[PDB]
Amino acid sequence: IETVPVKLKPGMDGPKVKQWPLTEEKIKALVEICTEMEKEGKISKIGPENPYNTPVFAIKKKDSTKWRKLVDFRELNKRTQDFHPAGIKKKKSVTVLDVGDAYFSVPLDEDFRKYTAFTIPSINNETPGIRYQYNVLPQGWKGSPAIFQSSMTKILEPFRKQNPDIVIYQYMDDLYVGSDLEIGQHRTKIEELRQHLLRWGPPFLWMGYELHPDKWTVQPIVLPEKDSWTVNDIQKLVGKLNWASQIYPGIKVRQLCKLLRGTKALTEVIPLTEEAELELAENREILKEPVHGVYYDPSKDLIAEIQKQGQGQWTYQIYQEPFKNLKTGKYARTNDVKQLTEAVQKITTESIVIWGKTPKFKLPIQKETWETWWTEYWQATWIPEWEFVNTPPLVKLWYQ
Amino acid sequence: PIETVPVKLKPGMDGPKVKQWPLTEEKIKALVEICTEMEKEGKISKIGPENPYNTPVFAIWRKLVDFRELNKRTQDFWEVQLGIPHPAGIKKKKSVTVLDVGDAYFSVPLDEDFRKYTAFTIPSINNETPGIRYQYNVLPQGWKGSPAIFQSSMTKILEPFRKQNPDIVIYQYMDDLYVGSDLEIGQHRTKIEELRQHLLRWGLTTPDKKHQKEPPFLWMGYELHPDKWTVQPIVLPEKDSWTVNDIQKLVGKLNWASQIYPGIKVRQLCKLLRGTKALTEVIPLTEEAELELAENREILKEPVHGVYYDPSKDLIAEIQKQGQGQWTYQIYQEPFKNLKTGKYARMRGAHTNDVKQLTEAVQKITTESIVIWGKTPKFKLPIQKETWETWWTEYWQATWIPEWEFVNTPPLVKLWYQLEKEPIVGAETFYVDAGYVTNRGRQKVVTLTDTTNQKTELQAIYLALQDSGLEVNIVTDSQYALGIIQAQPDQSESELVNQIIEQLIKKEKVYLAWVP
Ligand SMILES: CC[C@H]1C(=O)Nc2ccc(F)cc2N1C(=O)OC(C)C
Numbered sequence A: 001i002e003t004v005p006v007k008l009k010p011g012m013d014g015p016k017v018k019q020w021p022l023t024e025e026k027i028k029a030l031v032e033i034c035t036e037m038e039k040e041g042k043i044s045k046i047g048p049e050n051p052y053n054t055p056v057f058a059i060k061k062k063d064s065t066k067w068r069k070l071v072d073f074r075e076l077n078k079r080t081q082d083f084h085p086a087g088i089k090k091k092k093s094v095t096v097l098d099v100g101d102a103y104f105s106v107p108l109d110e111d112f113r114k115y116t117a118f119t120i121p122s123i124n125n126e127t128p129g130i131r132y133q134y135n136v137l138p139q140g141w142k143g144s145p146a147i148f149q150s151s152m153t154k155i156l157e158p159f160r161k162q163n164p165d166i167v168i169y170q171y172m173d174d175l176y177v178g179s180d181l182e183i184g185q186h187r188t189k190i191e192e193l194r195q196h197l198l199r200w201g202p203p204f205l206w207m208g209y210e211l212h213p214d215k216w217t218v219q220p221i222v223l224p225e226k227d228s229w230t231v232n233d234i235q236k237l238v239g240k241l242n243w244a245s246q247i248y249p250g251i252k253v254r255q256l257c258k259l260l261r262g263t264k265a266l267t268e269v270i271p272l273t274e275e276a277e278l279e280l281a282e283n284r285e286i287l288k289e290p291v292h293g294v295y296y297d298p299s300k301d302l303i304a305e306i307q308k309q310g311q312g313q314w315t316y317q318i319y320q321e322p323f324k325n326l327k328t329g330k331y332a333r334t335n336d337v338k339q340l341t342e343a344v345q346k347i348t349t350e351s352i353v354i355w356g357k358t359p360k361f362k363l364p365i366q367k368e369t370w371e372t373w374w375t376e377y378w379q380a381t382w383i384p385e386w387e388f389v390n391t392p393p394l395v396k397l398w399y400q
Numbered sequence B: 001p002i003e004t005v006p007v008k009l010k011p012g013m014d015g016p017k018v019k020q021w022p023l024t025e026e027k028i029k030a031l032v033e034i035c036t037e038m039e040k041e042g043k044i045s046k047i048g049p050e051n052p053y054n055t056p057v058f059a060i061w062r063k064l065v066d067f068r069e070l071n072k073r074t075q076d077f078w079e080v081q082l083g084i085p086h087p088a089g090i091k092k093k094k095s096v097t098v099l100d101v102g103d104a105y106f107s108v109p110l111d112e113d114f115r116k117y118t119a120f121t122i123p124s125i126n127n128e129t130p131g132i133r134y135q136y137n138v139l140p141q142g143w144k145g146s147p148a149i150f151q152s153s154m155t156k157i158l159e160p161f162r163k164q165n166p167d168i169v170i171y172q173y174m175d176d177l178y179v180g181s182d183l184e185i186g187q188h189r190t191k192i193e194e195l196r197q198h199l200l201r202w203g204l205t206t207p208d209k210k211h212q213k214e215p216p217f218l219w220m221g222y223e224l225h226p227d228k229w230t231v232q233p234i235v236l237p238e239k240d241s242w243t244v245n246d247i248q249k250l251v252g253k254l255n256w257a258s259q260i261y262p263g264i265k266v267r268q269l270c271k272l273l274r275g276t277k278a279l280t281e282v283i284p285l286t287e288e289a290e291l292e293l294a295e296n297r298e299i300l301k302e303p304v305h306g307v308y309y310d311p312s313k314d315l316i317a318e319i320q321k322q323g324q325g326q327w328t329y330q331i332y333q334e335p336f337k338n339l340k341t342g343k344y345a346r347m348r349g350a351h352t353n354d355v356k357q358l359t360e361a362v363q364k365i366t367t368e369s370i371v372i373w374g375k376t377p378k379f380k381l382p383i384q385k386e387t388w389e390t391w392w393t394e395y396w397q398a399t400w401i402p403e404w405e406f407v408n409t410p411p412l413v414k415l416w417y418q419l420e421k422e423p424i425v426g427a428e429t430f431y432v433d434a435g436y437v438t439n440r441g442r443q444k445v446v447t448l449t450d451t452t453n454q455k456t457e458l459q460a461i462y463l464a465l466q467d468s469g470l471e472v473n474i475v476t477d478s479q480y481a482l483g484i485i486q487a488q489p490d491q492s493e494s495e496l497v498n499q500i501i502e503q504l505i506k507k508e509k510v511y512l513a514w515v516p
Helices: A024-039 A074-079 A100-105 A143-162 A183-198 A231-245 A254-259 A274-286 A336-355 A367-376 A393-398 B025-041 B068-072 B112-118 B146-164 B185-200 B244-258 B267-271 B287-301 B354-373 B385-392 B453-467 B479-486 B495-506
Strands: A043-045 A056-061 A064-071 A093-098 A118-120 A130-134 A167-171 A174-179 A204-211 A303-310 A313-321 A324-332 A360-363 A385-388 B044-046 B057-059 B063-065 B095-100 B120-122 B132-136 B168-173 B176-181 B228-230 B316-321 B327-334 B337-344 B378-381 B404-406 B429-432 B436-438 B471-476 B509-514
Touching: A024 A043, A024 A056, A024 A064, A024 A118, A024 A130, A056 A118, A056 A367, A093 A183, A100 A143, A143 A167, A143 A183, A174 A183, A174 A336, A183 A204, A204 A336, A231 A254, A231 A393, A231 B509, A254 A274, A303 A336, A303 A393, A313 A336, A324 A336, A336 A360, A336 A367, A367 A385, A367 B354, A393 B479, B025 B044, B025 B057, B025 B063, B025 B120, B025 B132, B057 B120, B095 B185, B112 B132, B146 B168, B146 B185, B176 B185, B244 B267, B244 B287, B244 B337, B267 B287, B316 B354, B327 B354, B337 B354, B354 B378, B354 B385, B429 B453, B436 B453, B453 B471, B453 B479, B453 B495, B479 B495, B479 B509
Parallel strands: A303 A360, A360 A385, B316 B378, B378 B404, B429 B471, B471 B509
Antiparallel strands: A043 A130, A056 A064, A093 A174, A093 A204, A118 A130, A167 A174, A303 A313, A313 A324, B044 B132, B057 B063, B095 B176, B120 B132, B168 B176, B316 B327, B327 B337, B429 B436
């Protein structure tokens, strides 16, 4: 059994990513885990000649009390040389499977191992902190799916032809299983699969729950439909309208802005003249559907922004070009951070399903906070790219 | 002996070939002795004239070899050490012994394949005569990888003894080695001599009982006992004239104290630095500056000790507002049995409010704690759940505070005002743009000078607040201003803002709206 020559992108060197400090609870887990992975030759302690580093974390699992080790190979994958059924999204149901353990059988190119260097920190720097490196294919590394693909196909080939009514899509450490069968039959069929895996030597990702892509409908823009309309209401109305005009340029306010004739009192109730009425209705009619002409191109990055609508409600939008939204949605139901993580994850899993790639996020949260608590609720095997921002005032208004 | 760590030169680069500068026959002599000794010990070895590499050597006697060229061409190693532990995190010990480790690097092999690059040359006194060539077999002092490799080794050398003596704690720091236990005075001293042997069996020589340093232990600006901790002596100068440099050095020093000496304040002093033109410029101390200094020297007059972490007991953090934008806090396990204390003066962003700031405090502390005790403390905060809750569920950014209990210790943080969620009925309506026009026919166009498109949008609003009654409705087009006020700040660097904030606090009701 020989390994596969893998190189970093030309000229690039290995990652030297700093290890965010961990809670002795997560550290203890990691220690127990890595000790074992060591006994089983999966990993090996490394010396000082390895200056590289990737962050590790410990996360919990659904339906299990066992800790899962997560390695932020985000940077490594970005320096790794290079090497999707539109039907998955159309399926009634999709269950996610963690097949990450598959890789722990295939050895990693001897000369690439040094790049998988990661560290288990120690509290209060009371000890140098254990350093390790991978021998087999690591979970979360962009290349493992690839290198293991071959074997993965041979392993699926059977169930594939036997159960052609299914759609098996793999991504990083996850396997997405799709079908339209009635949910009852589904859960039963998933099993036959995982044993057909035990057959070659596999956890439910998320819960033992299935996503239902068939109903991920885009949350359109809406306008307040109310009885009496006050000057303020009209102003808010026009404000939201003008904004939206950027997208649907068929929006006309002329008439509504006429009701705002002069310096009236905010609470004054304005009656809507026909000209205006037919204007809103029309404007209202345009927004019922997402704008035409917005197509996704693999060529570009997928961006995702989340807005806090408070009350436990959140709003997001996925686009590539501003205003040019590919999808938009909501999320409700715990503390802020817990929710946001659940959401990101939810939005990510969605992206993978629809476009087979993770989006780049913009999180309305101070970085130190995120860094501090995200692992406390994370459950996915992957990690999107993210950046932290300051949600403008109006953006939240115009949404939800 | 010990496993050799394989080294390599940076990719493409080749070994050094820098010539040996000239040397006094006096120095040649001395070096040849030093080197012949080093050759006897085996640390170095004579090499054939075919080795084209070379690193300079001069004398202090003491052989000093210039490895910067080699270092520049040597691979990067795993960082020798980011953080150092912090006293508040360590545990109480009955006995703590520091072990010096003489000639550490000299006792550690060097990747054989690398040795040829360590080649240096001893000039021949007689010029007709060619000098001797040597290369290292061990970690060369002054070489890039010596620290990292030495330490690495040390660990492996320690692992065993550590397993057999789990009831013993060892922390390696550079060339010092700290060993502590809770063994009776005598048993303790014996392990020390067991260990010393362990090290000696690896050629590592340590200081005799009669010679090792004895606590308190002066470490990284601290002063450690085996039961309590503090910071080394801290003396404030008594002086007539202060120079910015003096001022700066002083403030700097005072901060260091803040980590255990609560009540330290630098406000007035830091203030003396405004507009200064030179480090050597004398600045007279304001009355308040004098006051602050005196009070500080007072606090520093009495030593205060931090206690060590008892991982058996909970961590408790308590925070207080010690002035506008100023927070104090202290983490203890045993009621008021401080492990550590500290301040927080960071205002992130031009404007804010106590709620927002108090929370940012909590995040720093949370981060600090995880780093030190690997866990977060229960917080005791001068803010009521409701208050927080309210501000929380209305703020656009997300945030989360661990388990915390309200502490009625004034000043309690609160929000000095809130914008009506709805336009106000029967309240005059001001349309601003530099002036305003109201639904009730009033107007006040005022032209400001030395302004900004932004400070002007802010001005309008202000005027409006001023001239308006107890309840006002305000319509602005400035998204900017909107964001700021909408954020409900209670403090800002901008005076205008503070003028406005003041205004806002006064109103009975205020509704601010935006339009293009
Ligand atoms: C070795 C025991 C360890 C510890 O748990 N408590 C103490 C108490 C007093 C000391 F002087 C040292 C230390 N220790 C430590 O790691 O000291 C480094 C900061 C130098």
